[PDB]
Amino acid sequence: QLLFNKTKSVEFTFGNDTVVIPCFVTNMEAQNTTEVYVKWKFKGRDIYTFDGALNKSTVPTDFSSAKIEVSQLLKGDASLKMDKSDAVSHTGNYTCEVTELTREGETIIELKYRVVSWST
Amino acid sequence: ELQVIQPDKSVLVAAGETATLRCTATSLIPVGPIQWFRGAGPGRELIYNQKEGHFPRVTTVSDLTKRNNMDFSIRIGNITPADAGTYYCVKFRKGSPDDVEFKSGAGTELSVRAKPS
Ligand SMILES: *[C@@H]1O[C@H](CO)[C@@H](O)[C@H](O)[C@H]1NC(C)=O
Ligand SMILES: *[C@@H]1O[C@H](CO)[C@@H](O)[C@H](O)[C@H]1NC(C)=O
Ligand SMILES: *[C@@H]1O[C@H](CO)[C@@H](O)[C@H](O)[C@H]1NC(C)=O
Ligand SMILES: *[C@@H]1O[C@H](CO)[C@@H](O)[C@H](O)[C@H]1NC(C)=O
């Protein structure tokens, strides 16, 4: 399998304009992005996919801001980036699934909203 | 072209012992996983994949964390008659909302026999 540097959860507040969901493969050994496939699942639904063979990123229109920095894939970084409107409407557990040729693996991260104090 | 080879058509195992289900891929392309199932069709049972899942009785013959690994053989410990059936080593291509079966091995019939005493 592909092995991960696991984070149980990440928190964001009213203050985050954008949010990052970490995903880090520790034994990534890919030479090219054509060898890689990425799936980000939110409550079992695919909300971001990257098909390396077609260099194609796909997101449903309710998750329009969802993206990964494709250049970081060879480093094992498949972290998901989204804007606050998508984060606030999709809090909960995410699964990050990565495939490199025939090796595969996944990890779960909870995106948690934290209510804090603000000055008008 | 890819071949998923199950060299054993059958395996006979004494109850309580370990079954070895052999599988080798001739290639690691197209991108996609190899999984083991019991049975074929709609009601086939997932027996193993590389993800963290619930396959406690399963160990792999080789080190599947290796990029160049082509051996997908598994071992199932403490065999009982309940484990009997035909096992398939199956290759998928990646897809959303579902990965698509690409190639399957020919199957290995696991049969079980009583152990003395
Ligand atoms: C996860 O893994 C790397 C080690 O490979 C570690 O150095 C890094 O701090 C970790 N990532 C994060 C964002 O904590
Ligand atoms: C939200 O913003 C803080 C900094 O203000 C940052 O440390 C944190 O990683 C952000 N949360 C997420 C989930 O991106
Ligand atoms: C990846 O391989 C494709 C051909 O399969 C090639 O077009 C592309 O430029 C390669 N990229 C790198 C960074 O090697
Ligand atoms: C997220 O999943 C973990 C188990 O991996 C569970 O403990 C947690 O309660 C889940 N959170 C939600 C809000 O579903």
Side-chain angles (χ1 to χ4, degrees), chain A residues 2-120, chain B:
Chain A
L2 294 179
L3 301 167
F4 297 77
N5 182 5
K6 306 189 276 183
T7 298
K8 184 197 187 186
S9 62
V10 289
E11 261 182 6
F12 75 110
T13 71
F14 177 90
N16 295 74
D17 294 346
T18 70
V19 320
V20 174
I21 309 185
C23 186
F24 296 102
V25 177
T26 58
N27 60 344
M28 201 85 174
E29 296 169 27
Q31 308 304 326
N32 191 302
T33 51
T34 61
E35 301 184 343
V36 182
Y37 201 96
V38 173
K39 292 193 193 165
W40 273 94
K41 291 178 191 242
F42 171 68
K43 292 172 175 176
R45 178 175 61 112
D46 296 343
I47 57 96
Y48 178 92
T49 72
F50 172 69
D51 181 349
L54 300 171
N55 195 59
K56 198 194 192 81
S57 285
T58 310
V59 291
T61 57
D62 70 327
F63 246 116
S64 68
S65 81
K67 55 202 170 82
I68 69 169
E69 192 167 332
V70 173
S71 78
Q72 308 305 288
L73 276 180
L74 306 188
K75 304 176 207 185
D77 176 6
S79 303
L80 182 74
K81 305 175 172 181
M82 69 184 80
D83 68 22
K84 61 168 174 189
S85 75
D86 292 334
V88 75
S89 62
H90 301 97
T91 65
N93 276 311
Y94 285 77
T95 299
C96 172
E97 179 202 85
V98 188
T99 311
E100 185 196 292
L101 301 171
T102 304
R103 293 186 300 149
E104 76 164 344
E106 64 182 22
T107 190
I108 310 168
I109 316 87
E110 190 183 352
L111 177 66
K112 301 165 76 171
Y113 186 91
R114 192 201 173 101
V115 160
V116 301
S117 185
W118 299 96
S119 286
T120 294
Chain B
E1 194 167 283
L2 174 68
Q3 291 187 38
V4 177
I5 303 151
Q6 284 176 252
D8 312 302
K9 282 288 172 291
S10 40
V11 160
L12 174 64
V13 178
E17 307 196 351
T18 304
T20 302
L21 298 179
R22 301 193 298 154
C23 179
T24 49
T26 60
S27 169
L28 306 174
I29 65 113
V31 173
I34 278 161
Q35 310 180 75
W36 276 92
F37 297 97
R38 180 170 70 171
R44 65 175 178 197
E45 301 142 283
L46 172 66
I47 294 296
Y48 177 84
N49 65 39
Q50 292 170 13
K51 296 164 165 191
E52 296 189 309
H54 190 66
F55 322 112
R57 230 159 19 102
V58 189
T59 54
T60 67
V61 173
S62 294
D63 180 1
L64 274 57
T65 67
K66 297 282 105 209
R67 179 189 152 82
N68 72 355
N69 178 50
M70 321 187 76
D71 180 19
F72 293 99
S73 309
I74 58 165
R75 292 192 183 105
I76 308 173
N78 192 32
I79 288 302
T80 83
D83 295 301
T86 319
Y87 290 79
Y88 299 97
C89 182
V90 184
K91 167 85 184 189
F92 293 79
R93 281 197 101 159
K94 296 305 295 178
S96 179
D98 303 281
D99 283 353
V100 175
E101 174 175 332
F102 186 67
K103 295 275 160 175
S104 176
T108 300
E109 192 67 41
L110 176 54
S111 282
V112 185
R113 68 173 173 84
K115 193 147 162 310
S117 86

